[PDB]
Each structure stands twice: as C-alpha cells, then as structure tokens.
Amino acid sequence: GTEVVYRRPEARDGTRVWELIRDTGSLDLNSPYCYMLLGDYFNDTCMIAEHEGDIVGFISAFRSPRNPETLFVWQVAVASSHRRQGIAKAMLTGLMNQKACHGVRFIETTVSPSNMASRRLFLGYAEEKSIPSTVTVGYGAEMFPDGTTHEDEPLFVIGPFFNDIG
Amino acid sequence: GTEVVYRRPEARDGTRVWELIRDTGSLDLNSPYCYMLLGDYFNDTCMIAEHEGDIVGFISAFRSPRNPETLFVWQVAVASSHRRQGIAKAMLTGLMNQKACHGVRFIETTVSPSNMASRRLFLGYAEEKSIPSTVTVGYGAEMFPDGTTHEDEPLFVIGPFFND
Ligand SMILES: CC(C)(COP(=O)(O)OP(=O)(O)OC[C@H]1O[C@@H](n2cnc3c(N)ncnc32)[C@H](O)[C@@H]1OP(=O)(O)O)[C@@H](O)C(=O)NCCC(=O)NCCS
Numbered sequence: 001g002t003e004v005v006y007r008r009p010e011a012r013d014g015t016r017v018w019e020l021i022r023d024t025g026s027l028d029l030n031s032p033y034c035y036m037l038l039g040d041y042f043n044d045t046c047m048i049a050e051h052e053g054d055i056v057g058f059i060s061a062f063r064s065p066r067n068p069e070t071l072f073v074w075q076v077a078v079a080s081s082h083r084r085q086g087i088a089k090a091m092l093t094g095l096m097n098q099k100a101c102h103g104v105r106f107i108e109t110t111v112s113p114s115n116m117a118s119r120r121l122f123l124g125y126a127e128e129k130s131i132p133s134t135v136t137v138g139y140g141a142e143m144f145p146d147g148t149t150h151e152d153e154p155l156f157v158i159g160p161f162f163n164d165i166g
Numbered sequence: 167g168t169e170v171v172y173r174r175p176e177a178r179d180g181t182r183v184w185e186l187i188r189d190t191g192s193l194d195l196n197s198p199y200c201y202m203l204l205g206d207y208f209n210d211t212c213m214i215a216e217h218e219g220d221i222v223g224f225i226s227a228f229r230s231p232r233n234p235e236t237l238f239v240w241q242v243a244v245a246s247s248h249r250r251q252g253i254a255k256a257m258l259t260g261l262m263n264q265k266a267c268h269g270v271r272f273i274e275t276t277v278s279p280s281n282m283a284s285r286r287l288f289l290g291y292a293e294e295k296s297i298p299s300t301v302t303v304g305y306g307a308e309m310f311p312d313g314t315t316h317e318d319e320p321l322f323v324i325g326p327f328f329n330d
C-alpha cells in the first residue's frame with residue numbers, strides 16, 4: 001500500500017474539494033468558490049487527505065472571531081471508497097496540531113442524527129483525550145428553507161482541552 | 167415612504183438571506199447552513215438591509231485570519247426591487263464604520279468582469295475616499311469545475327486606507 005498524505009488545502013483545491021463534498025450526499029454543498037475561499041483565507045485551520053493523487057478527505061474549520069479559543073469544525077468528509085480506514089480521525093488529530101490551532105480550548109461542530117459515523121468521530125476524539133463533550137440545540141430543522149426537509153443540527157461542544165492557567 | 171433599516175444578521179436569518187442570494191440568480195449560491203454560520207460566527211462583519219419587513223440587502227465579510235488588517239468582502243446582494251437606491255453603498259460604508267472593522271486597512275473582494283454594478287460599488291468607494299485600488303488575477307475561470315462555465319474572479323485590493 002501507499003500511505004495517505006495529509007496537508008493544508010490551497011485555493012486551487014477548491015474544485016476537487018467541492019466534488020468530494022458533493023459526492024458524499026450527507027453534507028450540504030456550498031459553491032466551488034466557497035471551497036476556494038477556505039483554501040485561500042482559512043487554510044491554516046483546514047486539512048486535506050490524499051491517496052494515490054486523489055483527494056479522499058477534507059476538514060474545514062475556523063477559529064471563532066468573537067471567541068477565539070473555540071475552533072468551529074464545519075465539514076468533515078471522507079470519500080466512500082476510503083472510509084473506515086482512520087482518515088477522518090487522522091485529519092482531526094492532525095488539524096489540532098497545526099500552528100494556527102495553538103491555544104484552542106474547545107471544538108464546536110454540529111452533527112445531525114443521520115451522520116452517525118460523524119458522531120462517533122467527535123465523541124470518540126473526546127473519549128480518547130479524556131475531555132468532556134456536551135450537546136445543545138444548535139440549528140433546528142425549522143430554521144431551514146421551506147419545501148425541502150433538513151435534519152436538526154445540534155451543537156457539540158468538546159472541551160476544555162486544557163485548564164485555566166493563572 | 168418607509169426608510170430601509172440596517173442591522174447585523176443572526177443565525178435565524180440564514181434562510182431568508184439564502185433566498186435573497188438565490189433569487190438574484192447571479193451569485194454563487196452557498197448552502198442555507200453557510201448563511202446561518204455567517205449570522206452566527208461572522209455577524210460582526212456582515213449586514214442586512216430590510217424594507218417593510220423584507221430582507222432587501224446582505225453583505226458577508228470577514229477579517230482575513232492571517233492578515234487581519236484586510237477585510238474580505240464575500241457576497242453583496244440587493245433585491246432587484248430595491249436596486250439603484252444606494253443600499254449597497256449604505257451597507258458597505260456602514261459595515262466599514264462598525265467596531266469590528268476598526269483598524270482595517272484594506273478591502274479585498276473579487277468582481278467578475280460582467281458585474282458592472284459591483285465594480286462601480288467598489289471602485290466608487292475607493293474613488294470617493296481617494297484611496298488606491300489594484301486588480302490582480304484572483305480566481306480564474308479555469309479553477310472552476312468541469313462542465314460548468316464561470317467568469318474569472320479577479321481580486322480587487324482597495325487600500326491602504328491609512329499609513330500607521
Ligand atoms: C464521518 C466520516 C467523515 C468518517 O470518516 P472515516 O475516515 O470513515 O472515519 P474513521 O475511519 O476515522 O473512523 C472514526 C470513528 O467512527 C467510527 N466509524 C466510522 N465509520 C463507521 C461506520 N460506518 N460504522 C461504524 N463505526 C464507524 C470508527 O470506528 C471510529 O470510531 P472509534 O474511534 O470508536 O474507532 C465519513 O463516514 C463520511 O464522510 N461519511 C459521510 C456518509 C454518511 O455517513 N452518511 C450517513 C447517511 S446515509
């Protein structure tokens with residue numbers, strides 16, 4: 001085998017990341033331009049996984065502007081062909097080592113009910129680090145547009161990763 | 167008639183903002199969830215305009231994480247009903263005068279060449295302030311997906327606003 005390689009995205013990755021997100025089904029697809037922005041302005045806090053030249057994983061995240069100790073994790077995707085190999089866990093652990101994630105004391109993310117593997121990713125991460133997790137309302141189904149059905153997006157708060165140091 | 171009123175967005179505005187952008191038929195439409203995140207996490211650098219209870223304008227923007235003296239302006243939309251009344255100018259100048267924009271020295275934004283009104287919004291902002299504008303390559307058409315056809319998105323850099 002050929003090991004999966006991990007790196008930050010670039011603007012040029014935007015199309016291929018877009019294609020990865022669209023091919024999941026279970027994520028809400030943003031514009032290609034959005035993923036170029038993430039690769040450009042936000043790439044210090046995002047991650048790509050590649051295998052034999054193909055993008056097989058992506059995480060988008062950003063530090064909250066008002067609450068910078070919080071990293072919001074937006075989308076996590078691994079290509080169908082490459083699931084259950086530890087790529088998402090490796091991307092999340094690797095994201096949290098990045099220089100721009102120094103000092104992050106909480107992760108926030110929303111995980112619906114049908115994103116069952118995603119729930120195990122995030123709650124398993126908290127377990128393995130022996131860190132608390134809590135779930136609040138997040139964005140309910142009612143907030144979404146009329147005339148299609150979206151699941152609730154409850155908010156997971158994972159942390160604190162480290163103590164308040166006097 | 168009734169004055170347009172301006173405010174920061176909130177997460178709950180995400181659907182209505184999505185619908186405004188959709189209805190333009192001419193902006194890259196993101197997910198409804200994206201606009202909820204903008205209203206939640208980025209609201210200090212965004213804005214809404216409303217008239218008689220309807221959302222008629224939106225800007226999204228954020229300060230660049232690496233280069234926080236730069237405000238990136240992502241999307242600007244005004245409902246077709248309400249165009250050419252100065253709502254976009256009012257949203258932009260209002261935005262730049264908000265607390266969260268103190269210390270911004272540059273605006274960055276992309277403006278495709280057929281978007282004549284957007285070009286005028288940004289270049290007119292620079293011109294009224296007597297501040298430089300510069301255009302560089304941005305995101306060319308070739309970056310966008312196969313089988314779709316997108317205009318180039320050249321990058322406008324407006325500034326510096328001041329020289330401290
Ligand atoms: C969430 C997602 C990114 C996980 O990526 P991944 O690389 O396969 O995940 P990993 O291999 O790193 O596994 C992370 C955790 O979830 C668990 N897990 C992942 N996929 C699972 C599955 N299908 N069944 C059971 N457990 C699973 C792993 O066992 C691991 O938990 P553990 O730490 O208790 O060992 C991936 O499933 C994805 O993109 N899914 C979208 C499709 C989808 O879930 N659709 C649901 C609607 S049909």
Ligand SMILES: CC(C)(COP(=O)(O)OP(=O)(O)OC[C@H]1O[C@@H](n2cnc3c(N)ncnc32)[C@H](O)[C@@H]1OP(=O)(O)O)[C@@H](O)C(=O)NCCC(=O)NCCS
Pocket residue numbers: 190192193242243244245248249250251252253254255256280281282283284286287290
């Ligand atoms: C770009 C947009 C936000 C401008 O909003 P607006 O509220 O109508 O703009 P304002 O009234 O504040 O005017 C801003 C500048 O644009 C000019 N302008 C706006 N619409 C114009 C048009 N149809 N004709 C020529 N000038 C135009 C104004 O004269 C003003 O320039 P000035 O300062 O030289 O006088 C709006 O056209 C819009 O939402 N368009 C749809 C979204 C988009 O950009 N789609 C892609 C393009 S087809």
Ligand SMILES: NCC[C@H](N)C(=O)O
Pocket residue numbers: 026027028029073074075076109110111153199
């Ligand atoms: N965590 C995922 C949240 C939302 N469903 C999205 O795809 O952006």
Ligand SMILES: NCC[C@H](N)C(=O)O
Pocket residue numbers: 033192193194195239240241242275276277319
């Ligand atoms: N400035 C607009 C850039 C892009 N066309 C979008 O709609 O996001």
Ligand SMILES: [Mg+2]
Pocket residue numbers: 277278279280285320
């Ligand atoms: Mg142009």
